[PDB]
Design a protein around this ligand. Structure first.
Ligand code: A1AMR
Length: 168
C-alpha cells in the first residue's frame, strides 16, 4: 500500500525518518524494501540480520537457493527476491564495505539500483559497520536516485546530524 508517514522531505524524491527499517516495513507494507546485503547474501547481523529475523529465516533460505543457482553478486550490484511478510519484493543491494578495503566509488553503482523501482523503503547504504561517512552516503543518494526513496535511519543522533548537514 506504500503508506509512509512521519518523513522529513529532503528533495522532491528523497525522504528521511528516524526509525527501524523492520518496523517501517510492517507499518508501511511497501512494494520494495531494500536490504544492505553482502555478495553471498549472508544476513548475519545489522540491517540484514534484522530483516532476516523479521521473516523468521525465510529470507536466508531463499537467499541461499538464489546463490546456489546464480553465484554471488558483485559490489555495487543487486538482485530482486521475495519480500516475504515485509514487502512485495526485497531488493538486496551490495554497497562497498570501506572497512574491508572496498572502493567508495561503488556507492554510486549501489544507489543506481534504486532507479529500477518507482518507490522503495531503504537504509543508508554503506553506513554503520561498512565504514562509509554517512553524510557522504546521503549526498550520493540525493544525487543518484531519481525515483521515490524513503530512508529509515535507526539512530536519532545520526538522523539530526544528517538533516542539519543537508540543510546547511
Ligand atoms: C547507521 C545505522 C544506524 C543503520 N542502522 C539501521 N538503519 C535502519 N534500520 C535498522 N534496523 C536495525 C536493527 C538492529 N537491530 N534490530 C532489531 C533486531 N531484531 O535485529 C533492528 C538497524 C538499522 C545502518 C545503515 C546501513 C548499514 C548498517 C547500519 S550496518 O548493518 O551496520 C552495515 C550495512 C549498512
Amino acid at each position: 500500500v506504500n503508506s509512509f508517514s512521519g518523513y522529513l522531505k529532503l528533495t522532491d524524491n528523497v525522504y528521511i525518518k528516524n526509525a527501524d527499517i523492520v518496523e517501517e516495513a510492517k507499518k508501511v507494507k511497501p512494494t520494495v524494501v531494500v536490504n544492505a546485503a553482502n555478495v553471498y547474501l549472508k544476513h548475519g547481523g545489522g540491517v540484514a540480520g534484522a530483516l532476516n529475523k523479521a521473516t523468521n529465516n525465510a529470507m536466508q533460505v531463499e537467499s541461499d537457493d538464489y546463490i546456489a543457482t546464480n553465484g554471488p553478486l558483485k559490489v555495487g550490484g543487486s538482485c530482486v527476491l521475495s519480500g516475504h511478510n515485509l514487502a512485495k519484493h526485497c531488493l538486496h543491494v551490495v554497497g562497498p564495505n570501506v572497512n574491508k578495503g572496498e572502493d567508495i566509488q561503488l556507492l554510486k553503482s549501489a544507489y543506481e539500483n534504486f532507479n529500477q523501482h518507482e518507490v522503495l523503503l531503504a537504509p543508508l547504504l554503506s553506513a554503520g559497520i561498512f565504514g562509509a561517512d554517512p553524510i557522504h552516503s546521503l549526498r550520493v543518494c540525493v544525487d543518484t536516485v531519481r525515483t521515490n526513496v524513503y530512508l529509515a535511519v535507526f539512530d536519532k543522533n545520526l538522523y539530526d546530524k544528517l538533516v542539519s548537514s543537508f540543510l546547511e
